[PDB]
Amino acid sequence: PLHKVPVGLWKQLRLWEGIYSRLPRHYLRSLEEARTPTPVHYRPHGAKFKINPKNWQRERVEDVPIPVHYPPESQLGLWGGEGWVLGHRYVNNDKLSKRVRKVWKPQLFQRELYSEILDKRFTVTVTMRTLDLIDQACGFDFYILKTPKEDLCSKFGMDLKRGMLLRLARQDPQLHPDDPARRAAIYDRYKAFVIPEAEAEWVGLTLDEAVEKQRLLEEKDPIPLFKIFVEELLGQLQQQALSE
Amino acid sequence: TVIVERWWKVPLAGEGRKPRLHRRHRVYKLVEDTKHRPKDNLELVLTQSVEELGVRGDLVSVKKSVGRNRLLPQGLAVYASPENKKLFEEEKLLRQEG
Amino acid sequence: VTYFSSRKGKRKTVKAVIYRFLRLHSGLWLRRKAGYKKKLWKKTAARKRRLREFVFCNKTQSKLLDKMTTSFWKRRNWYADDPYQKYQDRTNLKV
Amino acid sequence: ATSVSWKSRTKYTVMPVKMRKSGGRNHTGQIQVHGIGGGHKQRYRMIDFLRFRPEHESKPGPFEEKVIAVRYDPCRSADIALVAGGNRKRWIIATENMKAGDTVLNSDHIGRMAVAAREGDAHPLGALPVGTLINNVESEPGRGAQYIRAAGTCGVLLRKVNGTAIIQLPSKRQMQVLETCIATVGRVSNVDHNKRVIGKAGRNRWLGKRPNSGLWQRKGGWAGRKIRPLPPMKSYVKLP
Amino acid sequence: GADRMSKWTSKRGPRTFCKGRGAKGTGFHGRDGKFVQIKEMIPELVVPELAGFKLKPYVNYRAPEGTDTPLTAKQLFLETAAPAIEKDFKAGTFDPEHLEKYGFEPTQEGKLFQLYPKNFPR
Amino acid sequence: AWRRDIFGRIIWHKFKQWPIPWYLNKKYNRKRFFAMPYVERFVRMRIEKQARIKARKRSLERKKEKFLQEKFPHL
RNA sequence: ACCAAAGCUAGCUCAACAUACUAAACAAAUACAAAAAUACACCAAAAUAAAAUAAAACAUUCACCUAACAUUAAAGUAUAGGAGAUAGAAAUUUUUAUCCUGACGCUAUAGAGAUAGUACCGUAAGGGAAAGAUGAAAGAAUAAAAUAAAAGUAAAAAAAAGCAAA
RNA sequence: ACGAGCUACCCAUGAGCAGUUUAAAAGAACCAACUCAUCUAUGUGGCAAAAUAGUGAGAAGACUUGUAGGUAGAGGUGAAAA
RNA sequence: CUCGCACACGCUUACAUCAGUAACUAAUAAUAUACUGAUAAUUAACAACCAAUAAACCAAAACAACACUAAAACGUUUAUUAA
RNA sequence: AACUAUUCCAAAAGUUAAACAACUAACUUAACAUGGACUAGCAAUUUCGGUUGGGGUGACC
Ligand SMILES: [Mg+2]
Ligand SMILES: [Mg+2]
Ligand SMILES: [Mg+2]
Ligand SMILES: [Mg+2]
Ligand SMILES: [Mg+2]
Ligand SMILES: [Mg+2]
Ligand SMILES: [Mg+2]
Ligand SMILES: [Mg+2]
Ligand SMILES: [Mg+2]
Ligand SMILES: [Mg+2]
Ligand SMILES: [Mg+2]
Ligand SMILES: [Mg+2]
Ligand SMILES: [Mg+2]
Ligand SMILES: [Mg+2]
Ligand SMILES: [Mg+2]
Ligand SMILES: [Mg+2]
Ligand SMILES: [Mg+2]
Ligand SMILES: [Mg+2]
Ligand SMILES: [Mg+2]
Ligand SMILES: [Mg+2]
Ligand SMILES: [Mg+2]
Ligand SMILES: [Mg+2]
Ligand SMILES: [Mg+2]
Ligand SMILES: [Mg+2]
Ligand SMILES: [Mg+2]
Ligand SMILES: [Mg+2]
Ligand SMILES: [Mg+2]
Ligand SMILES: [Mg+2]
Ligand SMILES: [Mg+2]
Ligand SMILES: [Mg+2]
Ligand SMILES: [Mg+2]
Ligand SMILES: [Mg+2]
Ligand SMILES: [Mg+2]
Ligand SMILES: [Mg+2]
Ligand SMILES: [Mg+2]
Ligand SMILES: [Mg+2]
Ligand SMILES: [Mg+2]
Ligand SMILES: [Mg+2]
Ligand SMILES: [Mg+2]
Ligand SMILES: [Mg+2]
Ligand SMILES: [Mg+2]
């Protein structure tokens, strides 16, 4: 016999039933759409169409991402959207030579970075690509607000972002307690990214953490039947009092 | 960062279908190592006067080692960004005044 | 030869044929002679000519090539400017 | 699976402590070192290898200890001596002629006049004469003794340059150290340990030594008599 | 080939294997190694005087059964709290804040036998 | 509580009374209520197996009706 | 005349539909040596599938091979390949509802392994059976009723000479 | 994936070795228990998928042995007999 | 004619009493510790379960006087709390 | 190939002169540790052409 719905859709229809239904819509819409991550290891060709060199004919051409592995320790730092390339290689690059398994590993560095909005120095493992992206986006906090989830690739990056996004939507006074000058000054330049509060606490969440959170907002000790029966009784007694 | 390219051409799937991959599409040739490129420079705007490099309110080009690990942590410089640039446009206009 | 393909279940063509032979529509196959670019200084001009020819294959070879080649290659082709369009019909054949 | 090492006891005791041999196996259980196992059962005596160790941090000065008894040790080739002063006892490695009912000085104090060296004496290197025999030699000051502990071994103090001592290890290699490091003066106990004759294979087994393999290996290029110029001098002196 | 299927029991193992049959522990091991019983952990049977009362283990056959109505939270609310509540709302003395006079209990942790975590066996 | 055990079954876990709170408890801490990823495969199998059984129970009942209808055609 | 022989049921197979997809049953006990109410902790984790095989050997290669996108064509075409074996697209095209669900599928050596993952066999992972037939009634057993047909025997040992018959 | 309850080697923790000879508990000697397995005959679908009868070697040691643990197949372990 | 009584480990009712055995177990019988049924049964003093943290203790077991070398398993007491 | 050690270039952190002559370079390296090479160890994959008055040796193709 057959499953009525394809198994590929069993993950999706898992999210249409049960507690996942009661999750905030903006969050589910942030998980739904998977935007193609910025090319990192493979280098993309710009054109859609390319003239075949051998053939002399106009050829349709597509860009296929190269699978990259992210060890879990990459989720503790920020590696700049990159990771391990697991693959094979020919020796000497002659197609006729041996074919050999090969893995290319990113070069990692211990670097401490300063977050303005979070007023803190974090000791983080980053790549040279991360530093170039921070450089290019002109600030640490900039790089973290200005980059999509798929491009950071870190749970830690997403938690940093959740944090300073909250600090922006709240206008948290505890940022710089003594100097409202510094405070307004900093909260000023980042005014482009400011989002409401209901959105800001759901940004960097894994589906697990989300389901937990929603389970805790929904936590209620079932109401004693004495209450409900008392209210039914007061309803009936007030309708017996108002009819005469 | 290693930049890598496929030895075997991948067929097309054009409608938005995901490409159908074989094991032979896992064989890569190494086209570049970014770390081995001749390295670029970093452009900054100094907020104080550095010994060798220059004055407060100056536009300087250094090597990224010196800029990342000395100047920017110590608040001796800021990035070349436009919003940070207009500040020193104004500073240059109100300096030469008095 | 693949008689039933994996994806389509159709019958594949052996491309190694399609590069060295030519099928007229009559069923005759046409081929180059072997070794015609090889060691020319060492050969007679007569032999060289015999080599520069385009020649026809015997029945057995023809049937073999037809089996190794799908239907598409046996279709009637009208090419503009085609050298060989002159030769694709057969004439005055009493058998 | 996983085994825990027996080597956990935090507080120092003169009392013999019980220990578990493991023939050549690492903590995973695989054989790392071949040919070890099943000796006689042994207790272990904790040895204090820092010879200058002021009892209380209150009185820092050079102190003196009495040698109570000199005992055999199963764990090391040298013979060891029980040494008591103040309220405290410790096991130290015994110098050659050290005997029971004895007096032994432990001092960190250098001086311009050096010192007349007895046996049990522990002094900083800079405080000794330049021909002296030393054992239990520290590397970095405050570290504790590592070098020249084996039975009947002695190194020699060679010279003193630039607030630094240069000594000669029993392998006849030279070692450069600060002159602030402590050493004991003399040859280590039990000098005839060299000439001991193991009579029978059984005796070897008593020492926890399992026989060599039976496999026949042809000798390689590594084999022969290699005559190498003696190695350069090790310096534990960290230059600025 | 041993025995897989037959259930594991104290009769089966070595000397060192002692596994109770499921009676409940009445105490702890004390100082001397001797065992100490805690008078509180030993169930105290509460038995009424049966002698002066008339009921029997069986019932007369011609005695009727009845229409079977399972007790519901509602019926119990109507036999107890409803007369008192109606009496004090009709009199205007009803206080939605404190219902405790009607027998409602806000929290269970004060009283001896609690209903929800269920402090008593039977 | 409704929990998911090692085997991926959705189980009703009754609670137990302890003198110490749950994070300080060795023995309880070494139970796992959650499944690892491999378990997901087995879960699927379970479903399918179940589905089969139901599927051919249904077909049986259907069959039994037809037989009877040609044995007792009083309709 | 013995040994035997015959049933037609148990259920199964393949699809359709379908809601949606870990059944049933939970009082206690169950992750101490599972089924043992009760004491200060720890807890947890990921790395490319490989090869048999095809190439008449074997070394690059070798569809499918536990990753949703179907259907009609384009097309076994463009391309890719020790340019060998083989592999192989796309642009672009086509697809009209819902009911009429069943059977030129099996019938106890078949159909599920299944009366059962049981017995039994393995230390363990694991392997894994066989077996049913009276009648409306057996609350009709001095019991009544239709095959007596396999090999094996009995009823009934053998009598010169020979592929055993012609 | 599963296997070191057999066997190889280890780790913990226990247990055995009587008589005789010797200044001696000396990998000495005689000889039991104990441990092995020399030589022959039985046996060869056997009592037994390696035994029986005799006969032999060691027998305070590199000895035998119980219990609980360890090392795992690209491995382990090995007084090498693959 | 002489491998006996007990315990550990392991087996799990194969043990006990009464009855039955045409056939089933015993490599045959007789009958029964082993097949069948019914009914019972091993009772704790033995055994398992049965404290932590500090602190003084260098000093073998060998009839232990005292030693040998291969350097050796096995606890007292004092303090602090121990339902 | 991987892995284990070696050696080197690059990456990464640095450091010096304001360099020399007349009228930018050079050097540094604690533990980790990346990319690309080198030399070994330990290894991985695969194969033993045919004819032959049997095969082998010899001979031959
Ligand atoms: Mg030792
Ligand atoms: Mg010694
Ligand atoms: Mg040797
Ligand atoms: Mg040898
Ligand atoms: Mg079994
Ligand atoms: Mg027991
Ligand atoms: Mg027992
Ligand atoms: Mg008692
Ligand atoms: Mg092949
Ligand atoms: Mg073949
Ligand atoms: Mg082959
Ligand atoms: Mg394959
Ligand atoms: Mg090519
Ligand atoms: Mg070929
Ligand atoms: Mg298409
Ligand atoms: Mg069947
Ligand atoms: Mg079957
Ligand atoms: Mg017959
Ligand atoms: Mg005849
Ligand atoms: Mg064992
Ligand atoms: Mg004796
Ligand atoms: Mg002897
Ligand atoms: Mg014998
Ligand atoms: Mg005889
Ligand atoms: Mg004998
Ligand atoms: Mg003898
Ligand atoms: Mg002898
Ligand atoms: Mg074990
Ligand atoms: Mg192999
Ligand atoms: Mg091996
Ligand atoms: Mg050999
Ligand atoms: Mg049995
Ligand atoms: Mg009986
Ligand atoms: Mg019998
Ligand atoms: Mg090889
Ligand atoms: Mg291969
Ligand atoms: Mg040959
Ligand atoms: Mg041949
Ligand atoms: Mg010949
Ligand atoms: Mg011949
Ligand atoms: Mg030859």
PDB file of C-alpha atoms in Angstrom, chain C residues 2 9 19 27 32 51 75 79 95:
ATOM      1  CA  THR C   2      22.122  -0.398 -23.753  1.00  0.00           C
ATOM      2  CA  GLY C   9      13.669   2.613 -20.562  1.00  0.00           C
ATOM      3  CA  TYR C  19      31.587  10.014 -35.043  1.00  0.00           C
ATOM      4  CA  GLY C  27      20.851   2.026 -45.740  1.00  0.00           C
ATOM      5  CA  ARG C  32      36.878   6.881 -44.099  1.00  0.00           C
ATOM      6  CA  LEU C  51      43.437   6.000 -48.618  1.00  0.00           C
ATOM      7  CA  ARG C  75      15.550   9.666 -40.497  1.00  0.00           C
ATOM      8  CA  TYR C  79      20.146  19.860 -45.205  1.00  0.00           C
ATOM      9  CA  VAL C  95      17.440  -7.142 -57.442  1.00  0.00           C
TER      10      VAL C  95
END
